[PDB]
Design an enzyme around this catalytic site. Structure first.
Site, short mmCIF file in Angstrom:
data_model
loop_
_atom_site.label_atom_id
_atom_site.label_comp_id
_atom_site.label_asym_id
_atom_site.label_seq_id
_atom_site.Cartn_x
_atom_site.Cartn_y
_atom_site.Cartn_z
N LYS A 171 13.57 -1.54 -0.72
CA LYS A 171 12.17 -1.23 -0.48
C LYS A 171 11.99 0.29 -0.50
O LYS A 171 12.35 0.96 0.46
CB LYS A 171 11.69 -1.82 0.85
CG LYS A 171 10.22 -1.58 1.15
CD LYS A 171 9.72 -2.28 2.40
CE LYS A 171 8.25 -2.00 2.66
NZ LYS A 171 7.74 -2.74 3.84
N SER A 176 0.83 -1.20 0.00
CA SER A 176 0.00 0.00 0.00
C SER A 176 0.87 1.26 0.00
O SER A 176 0.45 2.29 -0.52
CB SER A 176 -0.95 0.00 1.17
OG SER A 176 -0.27 0.21 2.39
N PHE A 177 2.06 1.16 0.60
CA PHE A 177 3.01 2.26 0.61
C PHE A 177 4.38 1.75 0.17
O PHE A 177 5.16 1.27 0.98
CB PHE A 177 3.06 2.93 1.99
CG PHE A 177 1.83 3.73 2.34
CD1 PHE A 177 1.44 4.80 1.55
CD2 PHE A 177 1.07 3.41 3.45
CE1 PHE A 177 0.30 5.54 1.87
CE2 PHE A 177 -0.07 4.15 3.77
CZ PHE A 177 -0.45 5.21 2.98
N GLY A 178 4.62 1.84 -1.15
CA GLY A 178 5.95 1.62 -1.71
C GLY A 178 6.01 0.39 -2.61
O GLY A 178 5.00 -0.27 -2.85
N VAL A 179 7.23 0.12 -3.11
CA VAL A 179 7.51 -1.05 -3.93
C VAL A 179 8.89 -1.58 -3.55
O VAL A 179 9.78 -0.81 -3.19
CB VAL A 179 7.45 -0.72 -5.44
CG1 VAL A 179 6.07 -0.23 -5.85
CG2 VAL A 179 8.52 0.28 -5.85
N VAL A 180 9.05 -2.91 -3.64
CA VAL A 180 10.34 -3.55 -3.49
C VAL A 180 10.89 -3.80 -4.89
O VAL A 180 10.21 -4.39 -5.72
CB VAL A 180 10.25 -4.86 -2.69
CG1 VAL A 180 11.62 -5.49 -2.48
CG2 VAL A 180 9.54 -4.67 -1.36
N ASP A 190 1.83 -8.87 10.59
CA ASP A 190 1.39 -9.15 9.23
C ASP A 190 2.22 -10.30 8.66
O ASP A 190 2.91 -10.15 7.66
CB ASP A 190 1.48 -7.91 8.33
CG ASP A 190 0.88 -8.10 6.95
OD1 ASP A 190 0.11 -9.07 6.77
OD2 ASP A 190 1.20 -7.29 6.05
#
Length: 358
Positions: A61, A42-46, A157
Site C-alpha cells: 500500500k 483518496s491517499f495512495g494505491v495498493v 470504514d
C-alpha cells in the site's frame, strides 16, 4: 524516532524493482518487483509485488504523505496480531524526483475481496451460499472484537473492498486502517468518515462523540449486501443516504436522535413507517440472518450489537457444528482459537456459546 527507511528504484518498462533493508542486528537486502495495481483510495494505491529474495507475493500500500489529517494507520498496523487482520511485513519510503514522499506498507498478499466475490455471484445472477456469508461476517466480527477490546481501536470504514478473502481457505482479513482511530470520550472525533453505503446514521446526523457501534452498523450493511446481492442503502449523497435508511428503518424518534447525537436537536421530517425486515429479505433467508441484521441496524448505537456478542449469535450455529466443512469438503478456517485477551470480555455465558464443545 520513526525508524522508517529509504528505498532505491530500478525502472524502465522492462522491470520495476525497489530495494530495502528489512529490519535489525545486521540489516539485509530485500527487494520487490512491483506489478498490477489492485485498488486506490483518496491517499495512495495498493499494488501487488513479488519479493525477489523469498518469492512470496505481497500487497504494498503506497500512501501519499499529505499532512491533511491523522495517520494512525502505521501505528495500528505495527501493534496488531490476529488471524482476521492483515499482517504488516515491512514499511519504507518510495520518494522520487521532486514530487513528495510516499510511505509504503508491505502487507501479506490476499487475492480476492468480499467486493470481488460478491460481484462474481451477482454477475451470474445467483445468490451467495449462506455458509460463506456466515464465515465472512463471523470473521469480521471476530476481528472487530479484537480491534475494539484488545487494541482499543475503531476501524471506522468497514466496507467489502476493505475485506480480503482467501478463495481456498475462505479466511477473511480486515484491510486498510487509514481511517482507524482509538475513540476517546470527551475528545471530539471527525463526523465525515466511513463509505456512505456503510456509514452509521450517527455520522449522518453530525455526531462527534460516537462509539465502536459505527462499525457494527457497517457489518449490518455488509451482511445485508451479501444476502441481497446489492447495497442495502445505496445513497448518492449524505442527505440521500439518510433517506435511504429512513425508507427501511422508518423515521428516527427524538429519543433515537438523542442517542445518536444529543446536540443535533430537532429533525424536520415526516413520519415514514418502517418497511419491516421481513419484507426487505426473502422468505428463504434464515430468520437468524434477519434477526442479526436488525440488531446490527438500529438507530440507537447502545441497543446495537457488539462484535463478540454477534459472533455468538444463533446465525453462526452452523459454523460451530463439529461436522461443519467448506462445500468442497475442506475444513473451515480458524474460528474458535481465541486468545485469553480476546475473551477478556467477561461474560461466561458468552464464552460458553462462543467456543464449542470441541
Amino acid at each position: 524516532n520513526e525508524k522508517d527507511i529509504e528505498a532505491s528504484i530500478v525502472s524502465g518498462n522492462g522491470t520495476e524493482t525497489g530495494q530495502i533493508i528489512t529490519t535489525a542486528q545486521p540489516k539485509q537486502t530485500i527487494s520487490y518487483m512491483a506489478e498490477r495495481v489492485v485498488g486506490t483510495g483518496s491517499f495512495g494505491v495498493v499494488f501487488q509485488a513479488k519479493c525477489l529474495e523469498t518469492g512470496e507475493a505481497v500487497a504494498i500500500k503506497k500512501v501519499l504523505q499529505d499532512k491533511r489529517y491523522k495517520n494512525r494507520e502505521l501505528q495500528v498496523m505495527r501493534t496488531v496480531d490476529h488471524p482476521n487482520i492483515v499482517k504488516l511485513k515491512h514499511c519504507f519510503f518510495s520518494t522520487t524526483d521532486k514530487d513528495e514522499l510516499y510511505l509504503n506498507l508491505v502487507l501479506e498478499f490476499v487475492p480476492e475481496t468480499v467486493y470481488k466475490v460478491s460481484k462474481q455471484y451477482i454477475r451470474v445472477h445467483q445468490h451467495m451460499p449462506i455458509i460463506y456469508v456466515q464465515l465472512y461476517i463471523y470473521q469480521i466480527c471476530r476481528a472487530l472484537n479484537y480491534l475494539h477490546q484488545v487494541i482499543g481501536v475503531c476501524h471506522r470504514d468497514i466496507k467489502p473492498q476493505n475485506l480480503l478473502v482467501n478463495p481456498q481457505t475462505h479466511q477473511l482479513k480486515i484491510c486498510d486502517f487509514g481511517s482507524a482511530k482509538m475513540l476517546v470520550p470527551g475528545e471530539p472525533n471527525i463526523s465525515y468518515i466511513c463509505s456512505r453505503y456503510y456509514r452509521a446514521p450517527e455520522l449522518i446526523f453530525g455526531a462527534t462523540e460516537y462509539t465502536t457501534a459505527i462499525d457494527m452498523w457497517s457489518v449490518g450493511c455488509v451482511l445485508a449486501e451479501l444476502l441481497l446481492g446489492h447495497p442495502l442503502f445505496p445513497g448518492e449523497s449524505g442527505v440521500d443516504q439518510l433517506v435511504e435508511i429512513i425508507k427501511v428503518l422508518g423515521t428516527p424518534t427524538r429519543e433515537e436522535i438523542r442517542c445518536m447525537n444529543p446536540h443535533y436537536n430537532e429533525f424536520k421530517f415526516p413520519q415514514i413507517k418502517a418497511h419491516p425486515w421481513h419484507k426487505v429479505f426473502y422468505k428463504r433467508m434464515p430468520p437468524e440472518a434477519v434477526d442479526l441484521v436488525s440488531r446490527l441496524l438500529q438507530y440507537s448505537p447502545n441497543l446495537r450489537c457488539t462484535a463478540l456478542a454477534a459472533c455468538a449469535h444463533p446465525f453462526f450455529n452452523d459454523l460451530r457444528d463439529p461436522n461443519a466443512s467448506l462445500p468442497n469438503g475442506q475444513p473451515l478456517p480458524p474460528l474458535f482459537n481465541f486468545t485469553p485477551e480476546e475473551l477478556a470480555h467477561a461474560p461466561d455465558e458468552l464464552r460458553l456459546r462462543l467456543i464449542p464443545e470441541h
